Amino acid sequence: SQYQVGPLLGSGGFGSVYSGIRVSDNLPVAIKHVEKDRISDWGELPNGTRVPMEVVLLKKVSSGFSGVIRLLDWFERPDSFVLILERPEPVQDLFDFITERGALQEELARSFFWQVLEAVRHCHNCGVLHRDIKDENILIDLNRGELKLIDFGSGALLKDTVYTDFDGTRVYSPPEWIRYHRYHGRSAAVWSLGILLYDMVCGDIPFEHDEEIIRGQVFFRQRVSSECQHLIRWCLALRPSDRPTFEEIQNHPWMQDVLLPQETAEIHLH
Ligand SMILES: COc1ccc2c(c1CN1CCNCC1)O/C(=C\c1c[nH]c3cccnc13)C2=O
């Protein structure tokens, strides 16, 4: 009764997400219902309370401002958890944005990719690994030109040792996962970021099948500058240790002179 429930925004086997309004101040929110039977990965609060890892991860990153969706509150029900999340308005996810506009001008792709990089750096700094970076999980605040990372439902605490579990998106998953069901956090993130950048500048992902992912041969179907092509192929290095660090990505020549978010909005969104 504390929130006015609006239309369904999306759903899966994990659960369902509704547009909503906080009654007290009319704040736009998203109301995410997570089925207890579909969680798999349980976390624990400091106070000791088994919650979805998603709640743990969001609290670790929901602190000050960033390009990460804020968790405003959460509730437990007999068979589910309910998460109350920030909702920008107007908003569009990157998948829909690219679907409508096609391949993005590199100046726009640079701005978006830079903001995603800053958001992911914030997560890793907070000890959080997202594990499902992709266009569908990136919201665009259309008025402000600001991007926000969503859905930490496949995430994990960041660690320096190998991960053997994965339930993110396969076509964004690295060849070492496909081949050996093993990956390390940062290098796997960088791979998905390579897929994402290709998606931005070409208007579709580079690989569809397992065999393409493990071959790692990148074909460009759109005109893309040599510098951008280089960064993409670097992020998509077959050997994980050959991939760039976040610092190397942001220091790449293609990444220089990024637009401010409001400039990005004024030029590309308005
Ligand atoms: C299958 O649909 C899902 C799954 C997980 C999440 C989710 C949605 C709904 N749509 C999100 C964009 N891509 C299409 C699906 O939304 C989330 C968080 C949100 C926080 N504020 C928002 C505002 C507008 C939409 N979503 C959110 C999620 O974790």
Curated annotation (Swiss-Prot):
Keyword rRNA processing attached: no
Annotated tissue distribution: Expressed primarily in cells of the hematopoietic and germline lineages. Isoform 1 and isoform 2 are both expressed in prostate cancer cell lines.
Result for mutant: N47K: Decreased kinase activity
Binding, ATP: L9, G10, S11, G12, G13, F14, G15, S16, V17, K32, E86, D93
Superkingdom field: Eukaryota
Phosphoserine: modified positions: S63, S226
Post-translational modification: Autophosphorylated on both serine/threonine and tyrosine residues. Phosphorylated. Interaction with PPP2CA promotes dephosphorylation.
Keywords annotated in UniProt: Apoptosis, ATP-binding, Cell cycle, Cell membrane, Cytoplasm, Host-virus interaction, Kinase, Magnesium, Membrane, Metal-binding, Nucleotide-binding, Nucleus, Phosphoprotein, Proto-oncogene, Serine/threonine-protein kinase, Transferase, Ubl conjugation
Enzyme Commission number: 2.7.11.1
Annotated GO MF terms: ATP binding; manganese ion binding; protein serine kinase activity; protein serine/threonine kinase activator activity; protein serine/threonine kinase activity; ribosomal small subunit binding; transcription factor binding
Active site, UniProt feature: D132
Pfam families recorded: Pkinase
Keyword Ubl conjugation among UniProt keywords: yes
InterPro entries hit by this protein: Kinase-like_dom_sf, PIM1/2/3, PIM_Ser/Thr_kinase, Prot_kinase_dom, Protein_kinase_ATP_BS, Ser/Thr_kinase_AS
Example GO biological process: protein autophosphorylation
Stored CDD domains: STKc_PIM1
Domain Protein kinase: 3-255
GO CC annotations on file: cytoplasm; cytosol; nucleolus; nucleoplasm; nucleus; plasma membrane
EC top class, as a word: transferase
Xref: PANTHER family: SERINE/THREONINE-PROTEIN KINASE PIM, SERINE_THREONINE-PROTEIN KINASE PIM-1
Entry function: Proto-oncogene with serine/threonine kinase activity involved in cell survival and cell proliferation and thus providing a selective advantage in tumorigenesis. Exerts its oncogenic activity through: the regulation of MYC transcriptional activity, the regulation of cell cycle progression and by phosphorylation and inhibition of proapoptotic proteins (BAD, MAP3K5, FOXO3). Phosphorylation of MYC leads to an increase of MYC protein stability and thereby an increase of transcriptional activity.
Subunit architecture: Interacts with RP9. Interacts with HSP90AA1, this interaction stabilizes PIM1 protein levels. Interacts (ubiquitinated form) with HSP70 and promotes its proteasomal degradation. (Microbial infection) Interacts with Epstein-Barr virus EBNA6; this interaction upregulates and stabilizes PIM1 and induces cell proliferation by inhibiting the growth suppressive properties of p21.
Family: Belongs to the protein kinase superfamily. CAMK Ser/Thr protein kinase family. PIM subfamily.
UniProt protein name: Serine/threonine-protein kinase pim-1
